[PDB]
Design a protein around this ligand. Structure first.
Ligand SMILES: NC(=O)C1=CN([C@@H]2O[C@H](COP(=O)(O)OP(=O)(O)OC[C@H]3O[C@@H](n4cnc5c(N)ncnc54)[C@H](O)[C@@H]3O)[C@@H](O)[C@H]2O)C=CC1
Length: 280
């Protein structure tokens, strides 16, 4: 019976413990998932314990996702471009880091029956979610990433990000300011998919979308949301509008968790049962 952890501060918020523990039980796997209060100062010590105690792995979240990069042996092509991970797997002393937010959101897409090979994505954000999604999307075959980020702390992260993807991928990424309501509207027109990776659409701001008009969207478009609180973001409302195919936050949240599960467990995630149980 091995231990799988969550290293973060705070942790009161996490849905991972209930989610993983429930998939683990309804499959009779010998693993337990426990959250632990861990910031940057205690993280090195915690990784030390993960090895000495022979834990199976641990989920990683704020504020250690970037720092955790320095404590693993093997990062993934995508992780390397993101510069952050949320999952560590201990393979008998050997530690491999991954970013399941990205694979999860992308997986959610391939699962709706949409191919991302050769498509153009219009990405909103450059934070943790956005860059993870962009990175994995580029590595699975995206032709273009029309990233739109404003003049805040993240713009420069966008460039370097755009920088890395270009330097090691076949994908072309362009960063463009989000107040340019036009080169954007036209960006949305060249796109097959629109992905919201911004906090916009979440409580308090459960009433604000990054797309002014509804006519800026089009019917054959796929719009994906990272926000799962609530279920129907303003952006998802404007989408169901234009007749767009939609994918919600619980999509990225469920598949992301399946990825960690299979990574630690080796078995398939009772995705179906967990969706029930968590009340989605
Ligand atoms: N369903 C799921 O599995 C997950 C959902 N998320 C959600 O995705 C969102 C992004 O979270 P993170 O990347 O972790 O946080 P973050 O703080 O790193 O990134 C937020 C991003 O939003 C942009 N942004 C924030 N306010 C903005 C505004 N007013 N206008 C334009 N851009 C703005 C910033 O440029 C930044 O890059 C959150 O709402 C989070 O709850 C995050 C992880 C998983």
């Amino acid at each position: 019976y091995e231990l799988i952890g969550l290293m973060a501060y705070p942790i009161r918020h996490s849905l991972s413990p209930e989610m993983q523990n429930k998939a683990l039980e309804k499959a009779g796997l010998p693993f337990t998932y426990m959250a632990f209060e861990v910031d940057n100062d205690s993280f090195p010590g915690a990784i030390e314990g993960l090895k000495a105690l022979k834990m199976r792995g641990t989920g990683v979240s704020m504020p250690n996702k970037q720092l955790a990069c320095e404590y693993v042996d093997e990062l993934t092509p995508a992780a390397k471009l993101v510069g952050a991970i949320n999952t560590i797997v201990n393979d008998d002393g050997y530690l491999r880091g991954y970013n399941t937010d990205g694979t999860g959101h992308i997986r959610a897409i391939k699962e709706s029956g949409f191919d991302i090979k050769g498509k153009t994505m219009v990405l909103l954000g450059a934070g943790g979610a956005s860059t993870a999604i962009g990175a994995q999307g580029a590595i699975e075959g995206l032709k273009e990433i029309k990233l739109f980020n404003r003049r805040d702390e993240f713009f420069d992260k966008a460039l370097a990000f755009a920088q890395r993807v270009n330097e090691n991928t076949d994908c072309v990424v362009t960063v463009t300011d989000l107040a340019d309501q036009q080169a954007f509207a036209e960006a949305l027109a060249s796109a097959d998919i629109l992905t919201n990776g911004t906090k916009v659409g979440m409580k308090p701001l459960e009433n604000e979308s990054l797309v002014n008009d509804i006519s800026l969207l089009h019917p054959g478009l796929l719009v994906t949301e990272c926000v799962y609180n609530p279920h129907m973001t303003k952006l998802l409302q404007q989408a169901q509008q234009a007749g767009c195919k939609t994918i919600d936050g619980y999509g990225m949240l469920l598949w992301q968790g399946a990825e960690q599960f299979t990574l630690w467990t080796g078995k398939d995630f009772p995705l179906e049962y967990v969706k029930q149980v968590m009340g989605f």
